[PDB]
Design a protein around this ligand. Structure first.
Ligand code: NA
Ligand code: NA
Length: 296
């Protein structure tokens, strides 16, 4: 009988939103929110998706195939409006002037919701769980979301039980480089890796950002045990991007005495696995096995 309510702020303008029934023409502007919605079984309520970045999480591919793709990137306002949307979600940039400004959508009575896990450097795995619950509440499927969170917690506990009394490891996340490495500092990626005893060496350095350029000097000083490398390839059956980045690191004389480099501790991830979405605990299972040598 009560409304599900929330607020968002765009360009200093705060808007209050409410729904009393599930949206029926929802548009997802980002792959991460697309996966969140598909995980909750919401394809029938979806009028469109946008900006696919990598292969859809395989359990969700068949549901993904049921939803109209509006654009390979972000759709124009006209294409967006053409599906009569009533709800939109995505990363914050989806609602900026680089895409479709939120105020234009709000003019047309579209409700906009953004996962809290995507809003600040405070975000952690619990924030992602809460976001899934909230998304569930908005769409009248709270029990489905609670069932998913419950399963994630059970699996996470199984991983952590295997890790009890194993030494923690220091890690460096290598997204890419352009002279300097681009890496993760604070927020979601750092916080979820801490759950499996993997401590981001770029965290705790006073840089309040999710991602930014770092200095190799800093990485060398921190001497990580493992280097986790984001693979930006098309197929999971192809780790060419991963291997090229390994070779780029190996070929850099400045990095040759870093522990991870000497020991060949290179670990492959997709960005979708270490940023908010539905893949986190599944990815943490694999990473825990690779970093700590356990089987869970
Ligand atoms: Na509110
Ligand atoms: Na990023």
């Amino acid at each position: 009988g009560t409304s599900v309510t929330w607020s968002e702020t765009f360009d200093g303008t705060k808007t209050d939103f409410a729904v009393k029934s599930a949206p029926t023409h929802a548009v997802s502007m980002s792959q991460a929110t697309t996966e969140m919605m598909l995980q909750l079984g919401l394809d029938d309520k979806m009028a469109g998706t946008a900006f696919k970045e990598e292969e859809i999480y395989p359990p969700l591919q068949a549901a993904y195939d049921k939803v109209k793709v509006l654009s390979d990137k972000w759709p124009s306002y006209e294409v967006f409006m053409s599906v009569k949307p009533d709800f939109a979600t995505g990363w914050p940039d989806s609602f900026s002037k680089r895409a479709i400004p939120a105020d234009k959508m709000i003019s047309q009575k579209v409700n906009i919701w953004i996962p809290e896990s995507m809003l600040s450097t405070k975000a952690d795995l619990e924030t992602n769980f809460s976001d899934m619950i909230k998304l569930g509440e908005i769409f009248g499927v709270k029990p489905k979301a609670e069932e998913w969170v419950a399963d994630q917690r059970k699996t996470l506990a199984a991983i952590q039980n295997k890790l009890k009394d194993l030494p923690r490891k220091r890690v460096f996340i290598y997204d890419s480089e352009d002279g300097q490495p681009f890496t993760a500092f604070e927020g979601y990626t750092t916080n979820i890796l801490k759950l499996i005893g993997a401590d981001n060496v770029m965290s705790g350095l006073g840089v309040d950002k999710t991602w930014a350029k770092g200095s190799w000097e800093t990485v060398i000083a921190q001497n990580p045990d493992y280097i986790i490398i984001a693979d930006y390839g098309n197929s999971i059956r192809n780790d060419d991007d991963f291997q090229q980045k390994i070779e780029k690191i190996k070929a850099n004389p400045q990095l040759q005495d870093i522990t991870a480099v000497k020991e060949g501790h290179f670990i492959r991830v997709k960005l979708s696995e270490i940023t908010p979405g539905v893949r986190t605990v599944d990815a943490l299972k694999r990473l825990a096995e690779e970093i700590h040598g356990i089987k869970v």
